[PDB]
Amino acid sequence: KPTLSDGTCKEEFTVNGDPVKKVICTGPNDTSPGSPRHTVPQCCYGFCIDLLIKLARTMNFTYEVHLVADGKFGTQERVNNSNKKEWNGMMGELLSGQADMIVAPLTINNERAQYIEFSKPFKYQGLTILVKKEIPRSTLDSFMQPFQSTLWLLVGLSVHVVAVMLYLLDRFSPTLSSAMWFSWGVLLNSGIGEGAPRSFSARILGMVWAGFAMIIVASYTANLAAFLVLDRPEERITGINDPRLRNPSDKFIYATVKQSSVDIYFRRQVELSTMYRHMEKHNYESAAEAIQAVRDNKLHAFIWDSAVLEFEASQKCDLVTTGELFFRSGFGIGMRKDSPWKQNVSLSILKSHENGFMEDLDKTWVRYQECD
Amino acid sequence: PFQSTLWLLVGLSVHVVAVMLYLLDRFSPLTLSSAMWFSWGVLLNSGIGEGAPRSFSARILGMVWAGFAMIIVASYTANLAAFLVLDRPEERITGINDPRLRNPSDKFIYATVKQSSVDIYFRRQVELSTM
Amino acid sequence: ELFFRSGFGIGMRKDSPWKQNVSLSILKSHENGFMEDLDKTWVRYQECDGVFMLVAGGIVAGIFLIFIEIAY
Amino acid sequence: CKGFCIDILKRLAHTIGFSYDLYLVTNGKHGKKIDGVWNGMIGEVFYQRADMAIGSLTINEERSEIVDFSVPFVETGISVMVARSNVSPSAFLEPYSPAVWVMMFVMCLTVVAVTVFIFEYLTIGKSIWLLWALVFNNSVPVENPRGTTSKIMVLVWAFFAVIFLASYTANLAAFMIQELSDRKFQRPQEQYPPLKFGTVPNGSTEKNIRSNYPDMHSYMVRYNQPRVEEALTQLKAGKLDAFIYDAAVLNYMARKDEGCKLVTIGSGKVFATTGYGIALHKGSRWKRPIDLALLQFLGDDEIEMLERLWLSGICHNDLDIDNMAGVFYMLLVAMGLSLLVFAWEHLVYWR
Amino acid sequence: VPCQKRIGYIKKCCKGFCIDILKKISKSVKFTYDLYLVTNGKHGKKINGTWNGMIGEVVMKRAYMAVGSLTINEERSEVVDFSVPFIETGISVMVSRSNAFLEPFSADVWVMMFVMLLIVSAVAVFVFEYFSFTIGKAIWLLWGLVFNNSVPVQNPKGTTSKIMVSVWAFFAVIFLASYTANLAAFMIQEEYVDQVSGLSDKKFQRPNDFSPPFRFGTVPNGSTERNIRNNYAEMHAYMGKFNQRGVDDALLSLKTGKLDAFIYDAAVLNYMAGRDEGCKLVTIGSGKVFASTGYGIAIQKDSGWKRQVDLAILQLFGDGEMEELEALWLTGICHNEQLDIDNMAGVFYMLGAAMALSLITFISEHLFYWQ
Ligand SMILES: O=C(O)CC(F)(F)C(=O)N1N[C@@H](c2c(-c3ccc(Cl)cc3)c3ccccc3[nH]c2=O)C[C@H]1c1ccc(Cl)cc1
Ligand SMILES: *[C@@H]1O[C@H](CO)[C@@H](O[C@@H]2O[C@H](CO)[C@@H](O)[C@H](O)[C@H]2NC(C)=O)[C@H](O)[C@H]1NC(C)=O
Ligand SMILES: *[C@@H]1O[C@H](CO)[C@@H](O)[C@H](O)[C@H]1NC(C)=O
Ligand SMILES: *[C@@H]1O[C@H](CO)[C@@H](O)[C@H](O)[C@H]1NC(C)=O
Ligand SMILES: *[C@@H]1O[C@H](CO)[C@@H](O)[C@H](O)[C@H]1NC(C)=O
Ligand SMILES: N[C@@H](CCC(=O)O)C(=O)O
Ligand SMILES: N[C@@H](CCC(=O)O)C(=O)O
């Protein structure tokens, strides 16, 4: 968040009144790739910041948090302008010397493990899929909606034919308007009807009519029950292995975050470079705008860690995640090789899990249970 | 989907309310025979019975008295509806690459024809050696 | 769902001189409708081809109630 | 170049071991006889210009005479494709078939005589009138007995009726919880309209359909769609309604279209069922090393996995007017049933 | 793989998920193995300064490695080293499965027909007033029409007087049919009431003074019990009575009724839940881990293989090999997805309350003329 007019950047209280802990966070502002970058002091807070403060007090070291020059994670990025390759982003900064510790969501994989250590993960997670949620409207129906409206005039005509000849046979063999009260009343199941038939032909006809009475209302009860049961678009992308992903159809567009770990995962695989070869052109500079693009119906699917996507889906009730996790690897504090802080840092994380400390962080920074 | 003890409370409810309704009108400024004639039927929704509530206190009796059925008659329609939603996993019809096939503990004990080719197929498949 | 798709066949020794003849005859009777005729004739169709019971007691109970009502 | 057949070729070279160069054929399509000369994928293997012909080749009788095919690995026949038609019925709504119907009619018939008998102890017309009244929500003027025993027997009629009505909602609710005819086209223009159907007439599909049904082939010359997609678009536009081609391609095309609007005739109709294969040199002597290699991939998990990678498309197969107009058939017997009663009563006194 | 057992030696064979991982690593590290079962103790418990169990052999230079069911925690990291975890594990609780007229729909509906009570009453009197019963009797029929009952009541006459009530008649049947159809939907939308919310619930924290006490227990000599004995010491004292001897014997005691809770590992209870008859047992919270600590392979202190073994494990995740192992070995059968007294007792709560409303109206007659 941007700072205040003074050096400080405002204070506020949490749900229980505890003061949120913030640290000055210097870094570039107004990124806008293609424009000059200036360094303006800001302040950062959240999950990793709270954990970082705990380690500083325990092991008695001071710090000065600063952001990254380019908003990208690590990537090998082999180029022809150099001999073989050179690291870029956060990972390169750690090896250069400008950074001693890395505290941020950063997946543990093979490529980054050949040069840096990883301590132990805070939390375990995996990849998933984010898609646009279906129509919130339930398409709730009104009266005269179920069943054909035209044939309901036939039902209206059904009593018409019964009414006309009911008393027509009451004149020849043995008023016309005096018979429809019973005929109309019985289908109302009311007490208006009072004329008990006397002729055997009408007496039989009266009773066999009664069998026609209750079927529609019971059927209409079921038809109303049909309205509250049948609702299934069956639009659920099931896992990575769904055939829709394999074929690069143009009706849907797949995208991810540039230079992230998922980009490395797909490139390394010797088979998957058949769909994302077409989705490579459709990428993004960060995960903070792909959500907006999906919300604007310019995308169909997104691939990212379940730690972030699950939080976003809960907060805004316009997206629903689907699919299943298929690549599980927790985050972790990163540091250069032969660093002496590694043994102490790993023990504190393990000791924090048993103390229940991570439970407090989860319930004040992740879980909001909104619009469930 | 019924319980005798639960059927008892509804079954005995009519008897308790039938006697109470008749004796209530004595203090107003109902014979016992009528109380067992037009009260059993209405709760059962039957045309057997005669008479209508007469006293002002008797008039207010019918509100809850009538209100019994439609709030409970639909419940059975809901109560029966629960079971048709239940189909049981008896039609599990599980097959091909299922844990049921590779569950070697006295459940399915399925067999094939000796010699043949399916015996060769299982023998060749080293992943299903236990089966 | 099927998981081993492979047809049948007539078996014979390696040096059988009739192998080339037989394959052509099967492939010539497989398209002029002969296989359909055998399919329909033999394998195709071969068609396979408390409370309510207590109503007697209820009438007796009703008769017993009728007898009691008549007596009383 | 990549796909299904190429994947098999790459796998085959691993076990056997050789060097292969692809030689895409300039001449049109697979094969055809021009009275002495073979062309296409089979013309360049009979004339000793190649050693193998991999692709979507189909086994036949003329081809197998002059070349040696391998063991088939994909099924293929003859099929027709049509569009998608525009109810979920229940005749009388059939609660438990005409079994409970016999019970209620027989039960209600016997009680009327029984109830009439007990009235003499204390009515032919009153007993029958009230009995069918209460079981059908009354709503009719019916005599109410003043006795004690009579009122009890009538009373237990209602609670049986309503639970029957509640059960009469269950079966209708049951059906919705559980939750297509191609008799046409079976005629060579013998149908009332001018029927149109066409093929891509160069391959075995024409040759097989040219020998038998000669009259159909002569009429079919009016429709010679020289493509697969071009015939597809004309089919949707209503110009054509029947397309006859391979059953391993039409099925695939009808298994990836949007809206599930294209379903082949029947439920996977196949007529000849002559599988694919690999053409050889008739003297190549590579036939044996291929058969054992190919028969392995059909064994456990190899071939049964490739088809998931390539041919795995989606959009497969899956109250109206007659549902409520099922009891209408019983309305046609309403006035007729009552008409004969008057005639029967008229002859009672007259005769 | 051959699996030697000590104490004389009797040859046995070992297989499963852990063994499959072990042989895959040996094909990329270029080393062999001489597996042997641990005889004395199991899983380790530091007593009087000396260790035992599986971890008690790596410390005293007897195995140099240990692969199996090991939970990473701080007390073992100081003595022995651990590799990168390859599976998740926490701590959970296993329980059995359990055996309101306004609960369907909501209070929104019941504020509507109240208007119809006044509206229909005024309509009949207004029509009858013009042509010229009423409050005394006519209120009975129009409210009685709401309920399809055969009560013998008068039928008002009039060529047009009863025309509108016929129109008013079919409003009820479509209303009640709608009023009963939605009820079945709530049985489709039925939820699971559950009993507890986690280890921090009052029921777990209350040994006594909470009705018949909650019967929960576990098996000692493991990480799942030492963790409890360091934060909730007062709770661990009470649960000592309900101790078991193994997972299998304790599991069957749940069905009998002697126990109704089981605090154990969060990665082996899932297998029990997914491989039981009729899936009558479900974990609390649908797989809610509490103290997330994964598994791993324990290596001897200051071992050069540590840098190589963890790298190989991370290669398996990228190569997508772990999916086949878990699908083959760690897949269950069932998946988590009868009217009673308690549910319809609340229905009678208002009817019983509405019964008393008839008694108060009786005293109104006392002051009808006196006051
Ligand atoms: O002659 C007659 O009296 C007509 C009739 F009876 F022939 C008839 O209508 N039909 N016969 C069917 C049939 C054929 C076959 C396939 C295509 C055509 Cl064009 C002609 C025939 C077939 C072809 C090769 C090998 C086996 C076959 N087995 C079979 O059953 C198929 C069926 C048919 C279905 C759809 C269309 Cl659009 C047109 C005909
Ligand atoms: C990791 O923690 C241990 C235990 O606190 C640290 O060891 C202490 O180090 C300080 C100064 O380095 C000494 O004054 C203490 O006597 C040490 N205590 C013990 C028990 O050895 C260790 O220094 C920490 N790691 C690092 C890199 O500082
Ligand atoms: C059939 O077999 C005979 C003898 O094996 C052979 O001479 C002949 O060419 C074959 N084919 C035909 C069509 O007769
Ligand atoms: C069909 O084969 C003939 C054979 O010469 C060829 O001339 C013709 O172009 C082919 N049809 C199409 C559509 O290519
Ligand atoms: C746990 O350890 C104690 C102490 O060694 C021992 O008495 C007890 O038997 C052990 N538990 C089991 C189940 O063996
Ligand atoms: N796949 C077949 C289709 C046409 C035909 O039946 O010949 C082929 O090209 O040979
Ligand atoms: N692997 C864990 C599991 C504990 C248990 O199953 O009780 C340990 O030995 O500590």
CSV table of N, CA and C in Angstrom, one decimal, chain D residues 275-348:
chain,number,residue,atom,x,y,z
D,275,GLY,N,-10.4,-54.0,-40.9
D,275,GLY,CA,-9.5,-53.2,-40.2
D,275,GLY,C,-8.4,-52.6,-41.1
D,276,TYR,N,-7.7,-51.7,-40.4
D,276,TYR,CA,-6.5,-51.0,-41.1
D,276,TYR,C,-5.4,-52.0,-41.2
D,277,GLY,N,-4.2,-51.5,-41.7
D,277,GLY,CA,-3.1,-52.3,-41.8
D,277,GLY,C,-1.9,-51.6,-42.5
D,278,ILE,N,-0.8,-52.3,-42.7
D,278,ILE,CA,0.4,-51.7,-43.3
D,278,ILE,C,0.6,-52.5,-44.6
D,279,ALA,N,0.7,-51.8,-45.7
D,279,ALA,CA,1.1,-52.5,-47.0
D,279,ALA,C,2.5,-52.8,-47.0
D,280,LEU,N,2.9,-53.8,-47.8
D,280,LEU,CA,4.3,-54.3,-47.9
D,280,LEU,C,4.6,-54.6,-49.3
D,281,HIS,N,5.8,-55.2,-49.6
D,281,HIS,CA,6.3,-55.4,-50.9
D,281,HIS,C,5.9,-56.7,-51.6
D,282,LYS,N,5.2,-57.5,-50.9
D,282,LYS,CA,4.7,-58.8,-51.4
D,282,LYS,C,5.9,-59.8,-51.4
D,283,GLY,N,7.1,-59.3,-51.1
D,283,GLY,CA,8.3,-60.1,-51.0
D,283,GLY,C,9.3,-59.4,-50.0
D,284,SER,N,8.7,-58.5,-49.2
D,284,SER,CA,9.6,-57.7,-48.3
D,284,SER,C,10.2,-58.6,-47.2
D,285,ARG,N,9.5,-59.6,-46.8
D,285,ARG,CA,10.0,-60.5,-45.7
D,285,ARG,C,10.1,-59.7,-44.4
D,286,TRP,N,9.6,-58.5,-44.3
D,286,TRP,CA,9.4,-57.8,-43.1
D,286,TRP,C,8.1,-58.0,-42.4
D,287,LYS,N,7.2,-58.9,-43.0
D,287,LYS,CA,5.9,-59.1,-42.5
D,287,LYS,C,6.0,-59.7,-41.1
D,288,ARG,N,6.8,-60.8,-40.9
D,288,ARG,CA,6.9,-61.4,-39.6
D,288,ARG,C,7.5,-60.5,-38.6
D,289,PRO,N,8.6,-59.8,-38.7
D,289,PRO,CA,9.0,-58.9,-37.6
D,289,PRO,C,8.1,-57.8,-37.2
D,290,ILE,N,7.1,-57.5,-38.1
D,290,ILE,CA,6.1,-56.5,-37.7
D,290,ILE,C,4.9,-57.1,-36.9
D,291,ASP,N,4.5,-58.3,-37.3
D,291,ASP,CA,3.3,-58.9,-36.7
D,291,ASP,C,3.6,-59.1,-35.2
D,292,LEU,N,4.7,-59.7,-34.8
D,292,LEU,CA,4.9,-60.0,-33.4
D,292,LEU,C,5.1,-58.6,-32.6
D,293,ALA,N,5.8,-57.7,-33.3
D,293,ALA,CA,5.9,-56.3,-32.6
D,293,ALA,C,4.5,-55.7,-32.5
D,294,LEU,N,3.7,-55.8,-33.5
D,294,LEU,CA,2.4,-55.1,-33.4
D,294,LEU,C,1.4,-55.8,-32.5
D,295,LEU,N,1.5,-57.2,-32.4
D,295,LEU,CA,0.6,-57.9,-31.5
D,295,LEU,C,1.0,-57.7,-30.1
D,296,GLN,N,2.2,-57.2,-29.8
D,296,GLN,CA,2.5,-56.8,-28.4
D,296,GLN,C,1.8,-55.5,-28.0
D,297,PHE,N,1.8,-54.5,-28.9
D,297,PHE,CA,1.2,-53.3,-28.6
D,297,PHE,C,-0.3,-53.4,-28.4
D,298,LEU,N,-1.0,-54.4,-29.0
D,298,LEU,CA,-2.4,-54.6,-28.7
D,298,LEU,C,-2.6,-55.4,-27.4
D,299,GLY,N,-1.5,-55.8,-26.7
D,299,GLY,CA,-1.6,-56.6,-25.6
D,299,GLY,C,-2.2,-56.0,-24.3
D,300,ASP,N,-1.4,-55.2,-23.6
D,300,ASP,CA,-1.8,-54.7,-22.3
D,300,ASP,C,-2.1,-53.2,-22.2
D,301,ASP,N,-1.1,-52.4,-22.6
D,301,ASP,CA,-1.3,-51.0,-22.2
D,301,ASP,C,-0.8,-50.0,-23.3
D,302,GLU,N,-0.2,-50.5,-24.4
D,302,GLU,CA,0.4,-49.5,-25.4
D,302,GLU,C,-0.6,-49.0,-26.3
D,303,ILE,N,-1.3,-49.8,-27.1
D,303,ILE,CA,-2.2,-49.3,-28.1
D,303,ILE,C,-3.4,-48.7,-27.4
D,304,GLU,N,-3.9,-49.3,-26.3
D,304,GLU,CA,-5.0,-48.9,-25.5
D,304,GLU,C,-4.7,-47.6,-24.7
D,305,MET,N,-3.5,-47.0,-24.9
D,305,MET,CA,-3.2,-45.7,-24.4
D,305,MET,C,-3.1,-44.6,-25.4
D,306,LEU,N,-2.6,-44.9,-26.6
D,306,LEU,CA,-2.4,-43.9,-27.7
D,306,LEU,C,-3.8,-43.3,-28.1
D,307,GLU,N,-4.8,-44.1,-28.2
D,307,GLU,CA,-6.1,-43.6,-28.7
D,307,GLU,C,-6.7,-42.6,-27.7
D,308,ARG,N,-6.3,-42.6,-26.5
D,308,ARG,CA,-6.7,-41.6,-25.5
D,308,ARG,C,-6.1,-40.3,-25.8
D,309,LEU,N,-4.8,-40.3,-26.4
D,309,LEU,CA,-4.1,-39.1,-26.6
D,309,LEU,C,-4.6,-38.4,-27.9
D,310,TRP,N,-5.2,-39.1,-28.8
D,310,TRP,CA,-5.5,-38.5,-30.1
D,310,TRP,C,-7.0,-38.5,-30.4
D,311,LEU,N,-7.7,-39.7,-30.2
D,311,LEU,CA,-9.1,-39.8,-30.5
D,311,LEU,C,-9.8,-40.0,-29.1
D,312,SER,N,-10.1,-38.9,-28.5
D,312,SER,CA,-10.8,-38.8,-27.2
D,312,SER,C,-11.8,-37.7,-27.1
D,313,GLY,N,-12.4,-37.4,-28.2
D,313,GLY,CA,-13.3,-36.2,-28.2
D,313,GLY,C,-14.5,-36.3,-27.3
D,314,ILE,N,-15.2,-35.2,-27.2
D,314,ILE,CA,-16.3,-35.0,-26.3
D,314,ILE,C,-17.6,-34.7,-27.1
D,315,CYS,N,-18.7,-34.5,-26.3
D,315,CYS,CA,-20.0,-34.3,-27.0
D,315,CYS,C,-20.5,-35.5,-27.6
D,316,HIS,N,-20.5,-36.6,-26.8
D,316,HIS,CA,-20.9,-37.9,-27.3
D,316,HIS,C,-22.4,-38.0,-27.3
D,317,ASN,N,-23.0,-39.2,-27.5
D,317,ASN,CA,-24.4,-39.4,-27.4
D,317,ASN,C,-25.0,-39.4,-26.0
D,318,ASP,N,-26.3,-39.2,-25.9
D,318,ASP,CA,-26.9,-39.1,-24.6
D,318,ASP,C,-28.2,-40.0,-24.6
D,319,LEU,N,-42.3,-33.5,-20.3
D,319,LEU,CA,-43.8,-33.5,-20.2
D,319,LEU,C,-44.4,-33.6,-21.5
D,320,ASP,N,-43.8,-32.9,-22.5
D,320,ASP,CA,-44.2,-33.0,-23.9
D,320,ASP,C,-45.8,-32.9,-24.1
D,321,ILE,N,-46.3,-33.7,-25.0
D,321,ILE,CA,-47.7,-33.6,-25.3
D,321,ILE,C,-48.4,-35.0,-25.0
D,322,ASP,N,-47.8,-36.1,-25.3
D,322,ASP,CA,-48.4,-37.4,-25.1
D,322,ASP,C,-48.4,-37.8,-23.6
D,323,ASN,N,-47.5,-37.2,-22.8
D,323,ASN,CA,-47.5,-37.7,-21.4
D,323,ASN,C,-48.8,-37.4,-20.6
D,324,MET,N,-49.3,-36.2,-20.7
D,324,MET,CA,-50.6,-35.9,-20.1
D,324,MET,C,-51.7,-36.4,-21.0
D,325,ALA,N,-51.5,-36.6,-22.3
D,325,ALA,CA,-52.5,-37.2,-23.2
D,325,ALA,C,-52.3,-38.7,-23.3
D,326,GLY,N,-52.2,-39.3,-22.2
D,326,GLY,CA,-52.2,-40.8,-22.1
D,326,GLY,C,-53.5,-41.2,-21.4
D,327,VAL,N,-54.0,-40.5,-20.5
D,327,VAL,CA,-55.3,-40.7,-20.0
D,327,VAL,C,-56.4,-40.2,-20.9
D,328,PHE,N,-56.0,-39.4,-21.9
D,328,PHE,CA,-57.0,-39.0,-22.9
D,328,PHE,C,-57.5,-40.2,-23.7
D,329,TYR,N,-56.7,-41.3,-23.9
D,329,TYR,CA,-57.2,-42.5,-24.5
D,329,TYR,C,-58.3,-43.1,-23.7
D,330,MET,N,-58.3,-42.9,-22.3
D,330,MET,CA,-59.5,-43.3,-21.5
D,330,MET,C,-60.6,-42.3,-21.5
D,331,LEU,N,-60.4,-41.1,-22.1
D,331,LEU,CA,-61.5,-40.2,-22.3
D,331,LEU,C,-62.3,-40.6,-23.5
D,332,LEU,N,-61.7,-41.2,-24.5
D,332,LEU,CA,-62.4,-41.7,-25.7
D,332,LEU,C,-63.4,-42.8,-25.4
D,333,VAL,N,-63.3,-43.5,-24.2
D,333,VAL,CA,-64.2,-44.5,-23.8
D,333,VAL,C,-65.1,-44.1,-22.7
D,334,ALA,N,-65.2,-42.8,-22.4
D,334,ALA,CA,-66.0,-42.2,-21.4
D,334,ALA,C,-67.5,-42.2,-21.8
D,335,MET,N,-67.8,-41.5,-22.9
D,335,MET,CA,-69.2,-41.4,-23.4
D,335,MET,C,-69.7,-42.7,-23.9
D,336,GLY,N,-68.8,-43.5,-24.5
D,336,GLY,CA,-69.2,-44.8,-25.0
D,336,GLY,C,-69.6,-45.8,-23.9
D,337,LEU,N,-68.9,-45.8,-22.8
D,337,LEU,CA,-69.2,-46.6,-21.7
D,337,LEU,C,-70.6,-46.3,-21.1
D,338,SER,N,-70.9,-45.0,-21.0
D,338,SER,CA,-72.2,-44.5,-20.4
D,338,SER,C,-73.3,-44.7,-21.4
D,339,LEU,N,-73.0,-44.7,-22.7
D,339,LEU,CA,-74.1,-44.8,-23.7
D,339,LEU,C,-74.7,-46.2,-23.7
D,340,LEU,N,-74.0,-47.2,-23.5
D,340,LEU,CA,-74.5,-48.6,-23.5
D,340,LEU,C,-75.3,-48.9,-22.3
D,341,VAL,N,-75.0,-48.2,-21.2
D,341,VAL,CA,-75.8,-48.4,-19.9
D,341,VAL,C,-77.3,-48.0,-20.1
D,342,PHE,N,-77.5,-46.8,-20.8
D,342,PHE,CA,-78.9,-46.4,-21.1
D,342,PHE,C,-79.6,-47.4,-22.0
D,343,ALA,N,-78.9,-47.9,-23.0
D,343,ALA,CA,-79.5,-49.0,-23.8
D,343,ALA,C,-79.8,-50.2,-23.0
D,344,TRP,N,-78.9,-50.6,-22.1
D,344,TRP,CA,-79.2,-51.8,-21.3
D,344,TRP,C,-80.4,-51.6,-20.4
D,345,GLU,N,-80.5,-50.4,-19.8
D,345,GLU,CA,-81.7,-50.1,-19.0
D,345,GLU,C,-82.9,-50.0,-19.8
D,346,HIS,N,-82.9,-49.5,-21.0
D,346,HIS,CA,-84.0,-49.3,-21.9
D,346,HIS,C,-84.6,-50.7,-22.2
D,347,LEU,N,-83.8,-51.7,-22.5
D,347,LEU,CA,-84.2,-53.0,-22.8
D,347,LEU,C,-84.7,-53.8,-21.6
D,348,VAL,N,-84.3,-53.4,-20.4
D,348,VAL,CA,-84.7,-54.1,-19.2
D,348,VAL,C,-86.2,-54.1,-19.0
